[PDB]
Short mmCIF file of C-alpha atoms and ligand atoms in Angstrom, two decimals:
data_model
loop_
_atom_site.label_atom_id
_atom_site.label_comp_id
_atom_site.label_asym_id
_atom_site.label_seq_id
_atom_site.Cartn_x
_atom_site.Cartn_y
_atom_site.Cartn_z
CA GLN A 1 290.98 -5.45 -75.26
CA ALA A 2 289.84 -5.70 -78.88
CA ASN A 3 292.95 -4.05 -80.36
CA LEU A 4 295.22 -6.64 -79.08
CA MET A 5 292.82 -9.54 -80.17
CA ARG A 6 292.95 -7.98 -83.73
CA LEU A 7 296.90 -7.78 -83.38
CA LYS A 8 297.38 -11.47 -82.18
CA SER A 9 294.94 -12.46 -84.99
CA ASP A 10 296.92 -10.55 -87.53
CA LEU A 11 300.08 -11.73 -86.27
CA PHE A 12 299.28 -15.55 -85.95
CA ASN A 13 296.36 -16.40 -88.28
CA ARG A 14 297.38 -15.19 -91.53
CA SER A 15 300.65 -16.53 -92.58
CA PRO A 16 303.44 -19.38 -92.14
CA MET A 17 305.49 -19.32 -89.31
CA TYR A 18 308.92 -18.40 -89.35
CA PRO A 19 310.97 -21.60 -90.43
CA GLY A 20 313.94 -20.65 -88.20
CA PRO A 21 317.10 -18.80 -89.39
CA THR A 22 319.30 -19.36 -92.42
CA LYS A 23 322.81 -18.72 -93.58
CA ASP A 24 321.05 -15.87 -95.74
CA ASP A 25 319.38 -14.57 -92.75
CA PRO A 26 321.09 -15.56 -89.64
CA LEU A 27 319.80 -14.56 -86.06
CA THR A 28 321.42 -13.70 -82.97
CA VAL A 29 320.24 -14.47 -79.48
CA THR A 30 321.21 -12.60 -76.33
CA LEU A 31 321.67 -14.84 -73.11
CA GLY A 32 321.76 -13.88 -69.69
CA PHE A 33 321.45 -16.23 -66.73
CA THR A 34 320.09 -15.43 -63.28
CA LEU A 35 321.32 -18.04 -61.02
CA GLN A 36 318.97 -18.58 -57.97
CA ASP A 37 319.90 -21.99 -56.27
CA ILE A 38 322.22 -24.44 -56.24
CA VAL A 39 319.94 -27.06 -54.75
CA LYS A 40 321.86 -30.37 -54.70
CA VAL A 41 325.50 -32.00 -55.33
CA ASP A 42 325.89 -35.77 -55.99
CA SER A 43 329.47 -37.18 -55.05
CA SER A 44 328.33 -40.60 -55.96
CA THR A 45 327.46 -39.69 -59.45
CA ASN A 46 329.02 -36.22 -60.16
CA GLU A 47 325.75 -34.41 -61.02
CA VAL A 48 325.00 -30.98 -59.51
CA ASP A 49 321.23 -29.48 -59.68
CA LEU A 50 320.87 -25.97 -60.47
CA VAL A 51 317.85 -23.42 -60.43
CA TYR A 52 318.24 -20.53 -62.78
CA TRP A 53 316.40 -18.07 -64.98
CA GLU A 54 317.52 -18.07 -68.48
CA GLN A 55 316.94 -14.66 -70.23
CA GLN A 56 316.84 -15.01 -74.10
CA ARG A 57 316.33 -11.97 -76.71
CA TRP A 58 316.12 -12.14 -80.10
CA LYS A 59 314.05 -10.00 -82.89
CA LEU A 60 312.05 -11.27 -86.06
CA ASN A 61 311.12 -8.90 -88.58
CA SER A 62 308.03 -11.11 -88.93
CA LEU A 63 307.01 -10.03 -85.43
CA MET A 64 306.57 -6.15 -86.35
CA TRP A 65 303.46 -4.18 -86.56
CA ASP A 66 302.74 -0.27 -86.54
CA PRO A 67 301.26 0.37 -83.00
CA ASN A 68 299.22 3.23 -84.90
CA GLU A 69 297.08 0.68 -86.50
CA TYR A 70 296.59 -1.00 -83.10
CA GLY A 71 295.45 1.35 -80.64
CA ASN A 72 299.16 2.24 -79.79
CA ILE A 73 300.04 -1.32 -78.59
CA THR A 74 303.83 -1.46 -78.45
CA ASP A 75 304.15 -4.78 -76.65
CA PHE A 76 302.12 -7.84 -75.67
CA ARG A 77 302.50 -11.15 -73.61
CA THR A 78 301.94 -14.03 -75.44
CA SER A 79 302.41 -17.91 -74.90
CA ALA A 80 305.84 -19.15 -76.12
CA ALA A 81 303.88 -21.71 -77.89
CA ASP A 82 302.55 -19.05 -80.27
CA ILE A 83 306.12 -18.11 -81.55
CA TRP A 84 309.34 -19.30 -82.87
CA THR A 85 311.76 -19.93 -79.97
CA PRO A 86 315.58 -20.60 -80.28
CA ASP A 87 316.86 -24.41 -79.57
CA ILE A 88 319.12 -22.95 -76.82
CA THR A 89 320.45 -26.22 -75.00
CA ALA A 90 322.58 -27.39 -71.87
CA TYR A 91 325.18 -29.42 -73.45
CA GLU A 92 326.33 -31.30 -70.42
CA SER A 93 322.73 -32.12 -68.68
CA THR A 94 321.89 -35.34 -67.43
CA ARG A 95 318.10 -35.19 -66.79
CA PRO A 96 315.47 -33.49 -68.89
CA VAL A 97 315.27 -29.74 -67.74
CA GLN A 98 312.39 -29.32 -65.74
CA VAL A 99 310.51 -25.96 -66.24
CA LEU A 100 309.05 -24.04 -63.14
CA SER A 101 307.57 -21.07 -64.86
CA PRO A 102 304.87 -20.30 -67.12
CA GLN A 103 306.29 -20.18 -70.76
CA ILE A 104 305.12 -16.82 -72.00
CA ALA A 105 306.94 -14.09 -74.06
CA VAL A 106 306.80 -10.67 -74.27
CA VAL A 107 306.87 -9.59 -78.03
CA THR A 108 307.50 -5.76 -79.04
CA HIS A 109 306.33 -4.02 -81.72
CA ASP A 110 309.96 -4.04 -83.38
CA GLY A 111 309.69 -7.49 -83.49
CA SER A 112 311.93 -7.97 -80.60
CA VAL A 113 311.16 -10.89 -78.14
CA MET A 114 311.97 -11.29 -74.34
CA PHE A 115 311.42 -14.90 -72.81
CA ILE A 116 312.79 -15.72 -69.52
CA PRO A 117 311.79 -19.40 -68.11
CA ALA A 118 312.57 -20.58 -65.08
CA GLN A 119 314.55 -23.93 -64.86
CA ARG A 120 315.76 -27.00 -62.70
CA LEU A 121 318.71 -28.80 -64.41
CA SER A 122 321.23 -31.62 -63.52
CA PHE A 123 324.42 -31.50 -64.89
CA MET A 124 327.87 -33.13 -65.25
CA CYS A 125 330.03 -31.47 -62.23
CA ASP A 126 332.27 -33.25 -59.67
CA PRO A 127 331.42 -31.57 -56.10
CA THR A 128 334.54 -33.14 -54.45
CA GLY A 129 336.05 -30.37 -52.30
CA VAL A 130 332.60 -28.24 -51.83
CA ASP A 131 332.95 -28.47 -48.15
CA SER A 132 336.14 -26.45 -48.07
CA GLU A 133 337.27 -22.70 -47.99
CA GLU A 134 338.43 -23.12 -51.70
CA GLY A 135 335.02 -24.33 -53.00
CA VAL A 136 334.49 -26.08 -56.29
CA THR A 137 334.23 -24.80 -60.01
CA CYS A 138 331.97 -26.29 -62.40
CA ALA A 139 331.33 -25.07 -66.06
CA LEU A 140 328.13 -25.62 -68.24
CA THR A 141 327.87 -24.65 -71.89
CA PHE A 142 324.14 -23.67 -73.72
CA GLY A 143 324.02 -23.11 -77.45
CA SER A 144 321.84 -24.01 -80.28
CA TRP A 145 321.60 -27.78 -80.57
CA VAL A 146 321.13 -27.95 -84.49
CA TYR A 147 322.49 -24.47 -85.86
CA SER A 148 326.10 -23.43 -86.53
CA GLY A 149 327.39 -19.82 -86.16
CA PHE A 150 326.06 -19.46 -89.60
CA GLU A 151 322.55 -19.40 -88.63
CA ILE A 152 322.52 -18.57 -84.62
CA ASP A 153 325.07 -16.22 -82.97
CA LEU A 154 325.06 -15.65 -79.48
CA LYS A 155 325.58 -12.62 -77.30
CA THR A 156 325.47 -11.77 -73.31
CA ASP A 157 324.96 -8.12 -72.26
CA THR A 158 327.20 -8.62 -69.20
CA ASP A 159 329.70 -11.43 -68.42
CA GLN A 160 328.52 -11.52 -65.09
CA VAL A 161 325.85 -14.18 -63.98
CA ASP A 162 322.87 -12.10 -62.22
CA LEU A 163 322.92 -12.88 -58.59
CA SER A 164 320.65 -10.81 -57.02
CA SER A 165 318.01 -13.31 -56.45
CA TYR A 166 320.28 -16.13 -55.11
CA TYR A 167 318.89 -17.99 -52.36
CA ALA A 168 320.23 -16.49 -49.40
CA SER A 169 319.84 -19.62 -47.07
CA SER A 170 320.97 -22.23 -49.89
CA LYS A 171 323.45 -25.00 -48.93
CA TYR A 172 326.00 -23.51 -51.19
CA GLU A 173 327.22 -19.97 -51.51
CA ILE A 174 328.45 -18.67 -54.63
CA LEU A 175 332.01 -17.59 -54.94
CA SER A 176 331.80 -16.40 -58.55
CA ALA A 177 329.51 -17.06 -61.70
CA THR A 178 330.63 -15.91 -65.20
CA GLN A 179 328.74 -16.14 -68.56
CA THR A 180 330.86 -16.09 -71.40
CA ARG A 181 330.59 -16.75 -75.33
CA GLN A 182 332.73 -19.37 -76.86
CA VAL A 183 333.19 -21.19 -80.17
CA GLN A 184 332.98 -24.93 -80.13
CA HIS A 185 333.24 -28.00 -82.74
CA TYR A 186 331.43 -31.08 -82.34
CA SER A 187 332.47 -34.50 -83.97
CA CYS A 188 329.58 -34.70 -86.23
CA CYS A 189 330.03 -31.29 -88.22
CA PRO A 190 332.94 -28.83 -89.47
CA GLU A 191 330.86 -25.83 -88.83
CA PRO A 192 331.87 -23.69 -85.99
CA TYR A 193 329.14 -23.59 -83.45
CA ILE A 194 328.59 -20.86 -80.78
CA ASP A 195 327.94 -21.03 -77.04
CA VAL A 196 327.76 -19.31 -73.66
CA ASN A 197 330.12 -20.85 -70.91
CA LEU A 198 328.47 -20.83 -67.50
CA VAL A 199 331.44 -21.19 -64.82
CA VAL A 200 330.22 -21.23 -61.56
CA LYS A 201 332.69 -21.36 -58.21
CA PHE A 202 330.84 -22.63 -55.02
CA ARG A 203 331.37 -23.67 -51.61
CA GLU A 204 329.02 -25.02 -48.56
CA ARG A 205 327.45 -22.26 -47.23
CA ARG A 206 328.99 -21.81 -43.45
CA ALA A 207 327.84 -18.18 -42.40
CA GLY A 208 324.39 -16.73 -42.50
CA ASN A 209 320.88 -17.81 -41.76
CA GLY A 210 321.09 -20.79 -39.62
CA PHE A 211 324.49 -20.05 -38.52
CA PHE A 212 325.36 -18.17 -35.31
CA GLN B 1 372.45 -65.31 -19.14
CA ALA B 2 374.57 -64.72 -15.93
CA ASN B 3 376.02 -61.27 -15.90
CA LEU B 4 372.52 -59.70 -17.21
CA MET B 5 370.79 -61.40 -14.21
CA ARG B 6 373.15 -60.22 -11.80
CA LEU B 7 372.91 -56.56 -13.58
CA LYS B 8 369.33 -56.58 -13.26
CA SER B 9 369.04 -58.21 -9.48
CA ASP B 10 371.38 -55.36 -8.58
CA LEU B 11 369.39 -52.48 -10.29
CA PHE B 12 366.10 -53.85 -9.49
CA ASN B 13 366.15 -55.93 -6.43
CA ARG B 14 367.91 -53.72 -3.64
CA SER B 15 366.61 -50.14 -3.35
CA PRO B 16 363.29 -47.92 -3.52
CA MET B 17 362.34 -47.06 -7.26
CA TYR B 18 363.00 -43.36 -8.17
CA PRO B 19 360.33 -41.39 -6.62
CA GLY B 20 360.11 -39.24 -9.92
CA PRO B 21 361.82 -35.66 -10.61
CA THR B 22 361.83 -32.69 -8.10
CA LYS B 23 362.53 -29.33 -8.55
CA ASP B 24 366.09 -29.97 -6.89
CA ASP B 25 366.57 -32.83 -9.29
CA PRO B 26 364.54 -32.22 -12.65
CA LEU B 27 364.50 -34.26 -15.59
CA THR B 28 364.41 -33.71 -19.16
CA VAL B 29 362.43 -35.98 -21.40
CA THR B 30 363.12 -36.16 -25.10
CA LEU B 31 360.17 -36.90 -27.59
CA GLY B 32 359.67 -37.69 -31.30
CA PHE B 33 356.99 -39.26 -33.22
CA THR B 34 356.99 -41.51 -35.92
CA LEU B 35 353.57 -41.12 -37.58
CA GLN B 36 352.33 -44.17 -39.09
CA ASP B 37 348.67 -43.75 -40.11
CA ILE B 38 345.79 -41.35 -40.07
CA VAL B 39 343.00 -44.23 -39.96
CA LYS B 40 339.66 -42.68 -39.13
CA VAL B 41 338.18 -38.87 -39.21
CA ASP B 42 334.68 -38.56 -38.01
CA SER B 43 332.84 -35.27 -39.15
CA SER B 44 329.81 -35.99 -36.70
CA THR B 45 331.93 -35.78 -33.30
CA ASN B 46 335.22 -34.19 -34.64
CA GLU B 47 337.63 -36.91 -33.70
CA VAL B 48 340.40 -38.02 -35.98
CA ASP B 49 342.25 -41.32 -34.93
CA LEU B 50 346.21 -41.53 -35.54
CA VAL B 51 348.43 -44.42 -35.15
CA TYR B 52 352.20 -43.28 -34.20
CA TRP B 53 355.16 -44.62 -32.27
CA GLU B 54 356.10 -42.23 -29.46
CA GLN B 55 359.72 -42.26 -28.95
CA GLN B 56 360.84 -41.30 -25.40
CA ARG B 57 364.30 -40.59 -23.99
CA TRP B 58 365.77 -39.74 -20.71
CA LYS B 59 368.40 -40.60 -18.01
CA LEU B 60 368.56 -41.44 -14.52
CA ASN B 61 371.75 -41.93 -12.25
CA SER B 62 370.19 -44.66 -10.22
CA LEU B 63 370.30 -46.58 -13.56
CA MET B 64 373.90 -46.36 -14.18
CA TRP B 65 376.11 -49.05 -14.03
CA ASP B 66 380.05 -50.12 -14.65
CA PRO B 67 380.25 -52.66 -17.73
CA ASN B 68 383.37 -54.23 -16.32
CA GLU B 69 381.37 -55.30 -13.54
CA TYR B 70 378.71 -57.11 -15.60
CA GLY B 71 381.07 -59.03 -18.30
CA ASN B 72 380.86 -55.83 -20.68
CA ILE B 73 377.58 -55.25 -20.73
CA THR B 74 376.36 -51.84 -21.96
CA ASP B 75 372.71 -51.86 -22.67
CA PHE B 76 370.09 -54.16 -21.92
CA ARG B 77 366.01 -54.75 -22.69
CA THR B 78 363.51 -54.49 -19.97
CA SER B 79 360.03 -54.54 -19.28
CA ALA B 80 359.02 -50.90 -18.97
CA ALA B 81 357.15 -51.82 -15.58
CA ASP B 82 360.62 -52.49 -13.97
CA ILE B 83 361.38 -48.91 -14.03
CA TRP B 84 360.15 -45.29 -13.79
CA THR B 85 358.72 -44.08 -17.01
CA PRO B 86 357.38 -40.21 -17.47
CA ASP B 87 353.64 -39.32 -17.34
CA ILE B 88 353.97 -37.89 -20.82
CA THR B 89 350.12 -37.46 -21.96
CA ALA B 90 348.17 -36.26 -25.03
CA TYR B 91 346.20 -33.38 -24.03
CA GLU B 92 343.31 -33.57 -26.39
CA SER B 93 342.43 -37.18 -26.53
CA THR B 94 338.88 -38.33 -26.38
CA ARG B 95 339.50 -41.92 -25.62
CA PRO B 96 341.72 -43.87 -23.95
CA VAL B 97 344.88 -44.61 -25.49
CA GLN B 98 345.37 -47.96 -27.28
CA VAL B 99 348.57 -49.68 -26.96
CA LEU B 100 349.59 -51.59 -29.92
CA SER B 101 353.34 -52.99 -29.12
CA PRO B 102 354.87 -54.50 -26.37
CA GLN B 103 356.40 -52.21 -23.53
CA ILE B 104 359.81 -52.84 -23.01
CA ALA B 105 362.37 -50.27 -22.72
CA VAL B 106 366.28 -50.27 -23.72
CA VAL B 107 368.49 -49.11 -20.58
CA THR B 108 372.17 -48.06 -21.47
CA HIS B 109 375.06 -47.89 -18.84
CA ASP B 110 374.94 -44.34 -18.49
CA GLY B 111 371.54 -44.45 -17.00
CA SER B 112 369.74 -43.11 -20.41
CA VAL B 113 366.57 -44.98 -21.54
CA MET B 114 364.92 -45.33 -24.75
CA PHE B 115 361.27 -46.14 -24.88
CA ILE B 116 359.08 -46.37 -28.14
CA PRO B 117 355.60 -47.58 -27.57
CA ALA B 118 353.00 -47.58 -30.52
CA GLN B 119 349.97 -46.12 -30.01
CA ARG B 120 346.46 -45.66 -31.32
CA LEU B 121 344.85 -42.26 -30.45
CA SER B 122 341.39 -40.50 -30.90
CA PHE B 123 341.78 -36.64 -30.72
CA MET B 124 339.90 -33.71 -30.80
CA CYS B 125 340.25 -32.41 -34.39
CA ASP B 126 337.70 -30.70 -36.95
CA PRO B 127 338.39 -32.81 -40.17
CA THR B 128 335.87 -30.28 -42.48
CA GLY B 129 337.53 -29.91 -45.82
CA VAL B 130 339.88 -32.99 -45.59
CA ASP B 131 338.75 -33.94 -49.24
CA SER B 132 340.13 -30.72 -50.74
CA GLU B 133 343.53 -29.95 -52.16
CA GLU B 134 344.29 -27.78 -48.86
CA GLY B 135 343.35 -30.31 -46.40
CA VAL B 136 343.04 -29.91 -42.95
CA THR B 137 345.20 -29.22 -40.14
CA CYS B 138 345.06 -30.37 -36.44
CA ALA B 139 347.12 -30.18 -33.61
CA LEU B 140 347.80 -32.34 -30.41
CA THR B 141 349.71 -31.49 -27.45
CA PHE B 142 352.09 -34.00 -25.30
CA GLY B 143 353.21 -33.47 -22.03
CA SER B 144 353.60 -34.45 -18.23
CA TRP B 145 349.87 -34.39 -16.89
CA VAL B 146 351.52 -33.71 -13.55
CA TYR B 147 354.87 -32.02 -13.59
CA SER B 148 355.46 -28.61 -14.24
CA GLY B 149 358.43 -27.24 -16.31
CA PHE B 150 360.37 -27.10 -12.72
CA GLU B 151 360.40 -30.76 -12.75
CA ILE B 152 360.02 -32.08 -16.23
CA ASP B 153 361.21 -30.30 -19.12
CA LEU B 154 360.92 -31.79 -22.65
CA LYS B 155 362.87 -31.10 -26.08
CA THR B 156 362.77 -32.29 -29.60
CA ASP B 157 365.78 -33.72 -31.60
CA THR B 158 364.15 -32.45 -34.49
CA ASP B 159 361.00 -30.65 -35.21
CA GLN B 160 360.22 -32.88 -38.34
CA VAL B 161 357.86 -35.48 -37.45
CA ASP B 162 359.32 -39.16 -38.83
CA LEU B 163 357.20 -40.09 -41.95
CA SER B 164 359.47 -42.77 -43.09
CA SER B 165 357.01 -45.54 -42.02
CA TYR B 166 353.86 -43.65 -42.82
CA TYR B 167 351.47 -46.32 -44.69
CA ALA B 168 351.88 -45.25 -48.27
CA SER B 169 348.05 -46.64 -49.02
CA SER B 170 346.31 -44.59 -46.26
CA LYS B 171 343.02 -42.99 -46.99
CA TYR B 172 344.79 -39.76 -45.82
CA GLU B 173 348.13 -38.41 -47.02
CA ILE B 174 350.35 -35.98 -44.80
CA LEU B 175 351.01 -32.87 -46.27
CA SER B 176 353.11 -31.96 -43.41
CA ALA B 177 353.94 -33.05 -39.63
CA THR B 178 355.85 -30.92 -37.23
CA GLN B 179 356.80 -31.75 -33.33
CA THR B 180 357.59 -28.60 -31.63
CA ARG B 181 358.42 -27.65 -27.97
CA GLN B 182 356.10 -25.12 -26.08
CA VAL B 183 355.26 -23.53 -22.74
CA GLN B 184 351.43 -24.02 -21.94
CA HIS B 185 349.92 -22.92 -18.53
CA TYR B 186 346.52 -24.50 -17.28
CA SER B 187 343.77 -23.01 -14.95
CA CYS B 188 344.65 -25.08 -11.99
CA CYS B 189 348.05 -24.04 -11.47
CA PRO B 190 350.55 -20.96 -11.40
CA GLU B 191 353.60 -22.51 -13.07
CA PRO B 192 354.41 -23.07 -16.51
CA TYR B 193 354.15 -26.65 -18.12
CA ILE B 194 355.99 -27.83 -21.06
CA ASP B 195 354.48 -29.76 -24.11
CA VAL B 196 355.51 -30.65 -27.70
CA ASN B 197 353.04 -29.48 -29.79
CA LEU B 198 352.35 -32.26 -32.88
CA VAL B 199 350.84 -30.25 -35.78
CA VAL B 200 349.50 -32.36 -38.96
CA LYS B 201 348.32 -31.03 -42.06
CA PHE B 202 346.85 -33.81 -44.05
CA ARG B 203 343.95 -34.59 -46.82
CA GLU B 204 342.32 -37.30 -48.27
CA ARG B 205 344.57 -39.26 -50.56
CA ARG B 206 343.49 -38.90 -54.56
CA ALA B 207 346.48 -40.82 -55.96
CA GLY B 208 348.35 -44.11 -55.72
CA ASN B 209 346.76 -47.66 -54.91
CA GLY B 210 343.02 -47.58 -55.67
CA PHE B 211 343.06 -44.44 -57.88
CA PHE B 212 343.08 -44.08 -61.72
N1 SRO C 1 309.40 -13.50 -63.38
C1 SRO C 1 310.69 -12.96 -63.66
C2 SRO C 1 310.86 -12.94 -65.10
C3 SRO C 1 310.30 -12.06 -66.15
C4 SRO C 1 309.85 -10.58 -65.74
N2 SRO C 1 308.84 -10.42 -66.78
C5 SRO C 1 308.75 -11.26 -67.61
C6 SRO C 1 307.97 -11.61 -69.24
C7 SRO C 1 308.48 -12.70 -69.84
C8 SRO C 1 309.08 -13.45 -69.24
O1 SRO C 1 309.12 -14.80 -69.93
C9 SRO C 1 309.67 -13.51 -68.09
C10 SRO C 1 309.62 -12.42 -67.23
N1 SRO C 2 360.27 -51.54 -33.21
C1 SRO C 2 360.26 -50.25 -33.24
C2 SRO C 2 360.76 -49.27 -32.28
C3 SRO C 2 361.91 -49.60 -31.48
C4 SRO C 2 363.37 -49.98 -31.97
N2 SRO C 2 363.98 -50.58 -31.10
C5 SRO C 2 363.06 -50.09 -29.71
C6 SRO C 2 363.49 -50.45 -28.46
C7 SRO C 2 362.63 -50.47 -27.44
C8 SRO C 2 361.46 -49.88 -27.86
O1 SRO C 2 360.44 -49.62 -26.81
C9 SRO C 2 361.15 -49.68 -29.03
C10 SRO C 2 362.18 -49.92 -30.11
#
């Protein structure tokens, strides 16, 4: 498609990239989690491994275009390396994140972006009691590493984690999973930072496939 | 010493031993447990090992004597092999019982007997969930193997298991322990058989010695 080539060239070749948000031009990132699997627990190190898709949305004025000038194109996929992306980080990870999917975003003519990488993460979680009816609860916070709430605000569209793709024959069944916007402070700095608190209650699965 | 030797000779060396209880002459045995330790659980076989002392009391007319005729002796210790003892049996054991104490009874002039052997026993018990706050419940019935309620009846002096000697640094802590008289029927036989149902709720100790 000739029109799309023109669009990408015009967007990505003729100006400096977005330098990120500032106090004068803050940005709100919408977050949502799709929990796919609780893969492994480690009771000797108190780490638990999750597989999830992390849905991120935001909007930049610099990514806008008039579809009329581009054969009525209203959106396109492009490599996430072509655009600015927010530094949303898991605050209690114990290993580097492993990316499980392509990193390609969808950009819409109004400057809005959707980006949903699949990830595996090890995080700090004590799994003692997971083999009981009551199960166990762990929490994981996600937020900008370097930007305070004055530059990056966060939002969820729902407080329910998406479980519609959770692996039915996982070793672990989900009892509940919520995602909630919170405010935190770190020793280094006085300014409020925003996070999303992912809270998952789970236990060893003992009813379903493999069971009779 | 002379009077005791006389008493023992007279009680044990001049008559057939008591042939056990009958319908016409039934016997009631009082049972009580001192739970000392839950030593071990095995989740691959669903066996748990207990150490307890089993208090047994009963009374036989044939063990009576007049203390006046024996230098005021009102009771004596004697090997349990010298007297009839009830066939009180754990019904859900998985290994032969291991005896941890001498087997010696105290006999009193009214023909009553007290016998409290210490035992280790492996029994059928699923310990899944023992490492949680709720812990797990298991039960073990004790009763005559061969006598129905028409020959042997049972009772407890209290429904609360004696925990005053429980090992404070056991891997497992006791949440509750009861001992309750019940009636049972088995496939072999029409008659009711009496048992005491020992019900123990426990979990992995997470406080005290070794824990910070
Ligand atoms: N593959 C499922 C998620 C998904 C659907 N469409 C997408 C577009 C972009 C993206 O990063 C992710 C997605
Ligand atoms: N040694 C604890 C139990 C105990 C105290 N006195 C006893 C007399 C007889 C017996 O079998 C047992 C006992």
